[PDB]
Amino acid sequence: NLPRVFFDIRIGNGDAGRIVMELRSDIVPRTAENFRALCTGERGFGYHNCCFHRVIPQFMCQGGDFVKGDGTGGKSIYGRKFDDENFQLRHEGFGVLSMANSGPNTNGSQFFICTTKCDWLDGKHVVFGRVVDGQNVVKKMESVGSKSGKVKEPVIISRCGELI
């Protein structure tokens, strides 16, 4: 079955709710496993207490830099970087989960959730899942976002893991 994982989000001084994501292990098993393992922290590191460092309302939110905390870092379960697995899945609309990168074959831990059909990103970023619940929580993050992407208050992954 396809893994189901979650983030509990805190925006500034308030709990925002839970984002639930389904990971497409049927299409991108390596990329899905990286994300799932970073959610559970099973390898000794992951998204626990990490932040979203970019929030652009009506475009996307980006997070997952647990090494440097600012979007300049991160690491995968496979090492500092790993190859683009495939580009079989498209950025089809709200809630699509995809890997941030600095060019071909530079996947680490950083990821983004699109809040629109970011189809111009197809063939550049590996899509590996989708938000299936807590779309409202992703949308709540816009309250501290901006057109530039600068985040006004901390958006923290307070808790993360895998669900049955």
UniProtKB/Swiss-Prot annotation:
Residues 6-162 form the PPIase cyclophilin-type domain. It catalyses: [protein]-peptidylproline (omega=180) = [protein]-peptidylproline (omega=0). Keywords: Cytoplasm, Isomerase, RNA-binding, Rotamase. GO terms for biological process: protein folding. The keyword Cell division does not apply. One of its GO terms (molecular function) is RNA binding. One of its GO terms (cellular component) is mitochondrion. It is an enzyme of class 5 (isomerase). Its EC number is 5.2.1.8. Binds cyclosporin A (CsA). CsA mediates some of its effects via an inhibitory action on PPIase. The keyword RNA-binding applies. It is found in: Cytoplasm. Belongs to the cyclophilin-type PPIase family. PPIase E subfamily. PPIases accelerate the folding of proteins. It catalyzes the cis-trans isomerization of proline imidic peptide bonds in oligopeptides. This is Peptidyl-prolyl cis-trans isomerase E. It comes from Schistosoma mansoni (Blood fluke). The chain holds residues 110 to 273 of 273 of the full protein.
